[PDB]
């Protein structure tokens, strides 16, 4: 019954923007951490951004600092990932994640995983 509904991915030219969205139906107070991980073929899965339940603490992988912003709207049970200045190395499957544990947002101990959304940054 814990569903992470992902949207917002697709194909985008380098320098362009996207907004990923992760909607969790129901009562999400127990999920203190929510975030995004990404994995491209042949590379290891990687933390991208995370946020706490109150929406006032965040963290990011260094390669996206200054380009991505994660935010949380509990009134709509949604976490958003605004992705600006996209680069080809941002190409990957992006996964919404959630976890109850009161650990650092970047600690890769997340127990709930979305099915993933493809993001492709073209340089043609």
| Domains defined along the chain, listed by start | 5-103 (2.60.40.10)
- Method used to obtain the model: X-ray
**CB proximity list for 34: less than 8 A, separation 6 or greater:** 22, 24, 50, 51, 72, 79, 96, 97, 98, 99
Strands 18-23 and 78-83: antiparallel
Question: What are the backbone dihedrals phi and psi of residue 89, each rounded to the nearest 5 degrees, phi first?
Answer: -70, -5
How many Å apart are CA 80 and CA 78, to the nearest integer?
Answer: 6
Q: Resolution of the coordinates in A?
A: 1.8
How many Å apart are CA 31 and CA 21, to the nearest integer?
Answer: 16
Chain mean position to CA 9: 11
How many Å apart are CA 79 and CA 23, to the nearest integer?
Answer: 7
How many Å apart are CA 106 and CA 48, to the nearest integer?
Answer: 8
């Amino acid at each position: 019954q814990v569903q992470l509904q992902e949207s917002g991915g697709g194909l985008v030219q380098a320098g362009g923007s996207l907004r990923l969205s992760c909607v969790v139906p129901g009562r999400t107070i127990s999920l203190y951490r929510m975030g995004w991980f990404r994995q491209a073929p042949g590379k290891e899965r990687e933390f991208v951004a995370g946020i706490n339940w109150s929406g006032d603490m965040t963290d990011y992988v260094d390669s996206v600092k200054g380009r991505f912003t994660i935010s949380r709207d509990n009134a709509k049970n949604t976490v958003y990932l605004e992705m600006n200045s996209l680069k080809p190395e941002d190409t990957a499957i992006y996964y919404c994640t959630a976890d109850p544990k009161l650990l650092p947002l970047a600690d890769s101990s997340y127990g709930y995983w979305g099915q993933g959304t493809q993001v492709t940054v073209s340089s043609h």
